[PDB]
Design a protein around this ligand. Structure first.
Ligand SMILES: *C(=O)[C@H](N)Cc1ccccc1
Ligand SMILES: [Ba+2]
Ligand SMILES: [Ba+2]
Ligand SMILES: [Ba+2]
Ligand SMILES: [Ba+2]
Ligand SMILES: [Ba+2]
Length: 362
């Protein structure tokens, strides 16, 4: 179709901007998921990008951890409004923290991501990340305002583990991945994944990487304007804040089924997507968030989903509610600065695709 050719052109023009490669999955209403890739999975081997190339989905992981949590609310074991002291009695200010503030980025919890070395071979415990957060981060009061929290999702994961007796990966697999047919999806912290199948991740030495968001010391020297950051960071360091590996095809499987009532009941879905407050993420299109989903505005279209940044892989997923379209676009180009073209610029092809969808619908 004309749409098919318009979309492949958007991806081609984006990789021509300097982006190593991009993988997209797009489901439109009354249609099968159609996949589009451009550029390379492996810059130096010139391997073409396919729809079978795995990516680290980074904070997109967060939409699954919320779902898993919401599933345990349906199970009757967890209450969104009850204090987390039940699970974390010694956590400062815990009594002011209902289960929902873990998910909604209003908890005031101190964060770990900006202090955590991105290059290491160190494995992390959930608790180890939490002690790290309080040691290096800044704690604000609950409900102070919106400030993106990874720590809240790490704590969310620990609730899941305690309530189900097994690692949070077991719950997400048995309740989400398995019944949906998601066969190319792993939870990094607790599961091994086929490294050989992953698209390589590229950090660009770019002029606009003026204010790196990560401690990337130990990177060594670049080669042909990039570092291969694929295996820089152990996923156990991100934990429930961003440890999942997947394909855009598998993610669209999840999204269609979530927005289609087939995972979460109508009340848990409403919490996730409709019970919202204003939200900010530096260099993104985020305007609001629920309890697991960021609302990201692209001109006259909006996606409910998530952004993901982990060194070298850069992802945007969501559903457009006005049009029914689901999409996961991931590039294997990244940088550190939020405002870098290599991070913030992933939003441009996403915008253009939603414009092409809209125009083909008129
Ligand atoms: C979301 O994309 C967060 N940046 C994921 C993350 C990555 C590293 C360490 C903690 C959280
Ligand atoms: Ba600087
Ligand atoms: Ba390493
Ligand atoms: Ba509109
Ligand atoms: Ba409107
Ligand atoms: Ba038209």
């Amino acid at each position: 179709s004309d749409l098919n050719n318009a979309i492949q052109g958007i991806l081609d023009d984006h990789v021509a901007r300097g982006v190593v490669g991009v993988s997209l999955a797009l489901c439109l209403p009354g249609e099968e998921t159609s996949l589009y890739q451009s550029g390379y999975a492996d810059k130096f081997n010139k391997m073409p990008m396919t729809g079978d190339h795995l990516f680290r989905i980074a904070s997109c992981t967060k939409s699954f951890i919320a779902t898993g949590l919401h599933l345990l609310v349906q199970d009757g074991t967890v209450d969104l409004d009850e204090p987390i002291t039940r699970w974390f009695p010694d956590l400062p200010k815990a009594a002011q923290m209902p289960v929902r503030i873990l998910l909604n980025h209003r908890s005031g919890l101190p964060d770990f991501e900006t202090s955590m070395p991105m290059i290491s071979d160190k494995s992390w415990t959930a608790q180890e990340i939490v002690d790290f957060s309080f040691r290096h981060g800044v704690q604000k009061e609950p409900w102070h305002g919106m400030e993106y929290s990874n720590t809240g999702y790490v704590l969310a994961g620990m609730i899941i583990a305690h309530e189900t007796g097994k690692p949070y990966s077991d719950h997400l697999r048995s309740r989400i991945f398995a019944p949906l047919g998601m066969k190319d999806t792993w939870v990094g912290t607790h599961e091994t994944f086929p490294i050989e199948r992953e698209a390589r991740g590229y950090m660009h030495a770019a002029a606009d990487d003026e204010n790196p968001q990560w401690d990337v010391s130990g990177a060594g020297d670049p080669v042909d304007g990039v570092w291969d950051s694929t295996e820089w960071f152990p996923l156990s360091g991100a934990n429930a804040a961003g440890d999942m590996v997947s394909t855009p095809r598998d993610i669209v499987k999840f999204l269609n089924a979530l927005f289609d009532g087939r995972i979460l009941d109508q009340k848990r879905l409403w919490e996730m997507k409709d019970n919202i407050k204003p939200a900010f993420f530096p260099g993104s299109n985020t305007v609001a968030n629920g309890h697991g989903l960021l609302l990201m505005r692209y001109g006259s279209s909006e996606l409910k989903g998530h952004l993901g940044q982990i060194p070298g892989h850069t992802s945007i997923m969501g559903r457009d509610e006005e049009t029914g379209a689901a999409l996961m676009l991931i590039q294997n180009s990244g940088a550190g600065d939020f405002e870098s073209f290599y991070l913030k610029g992933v939003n441009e092809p996403v915008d253009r695709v939603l414009e092409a969808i809209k125009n083909s619908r008129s």
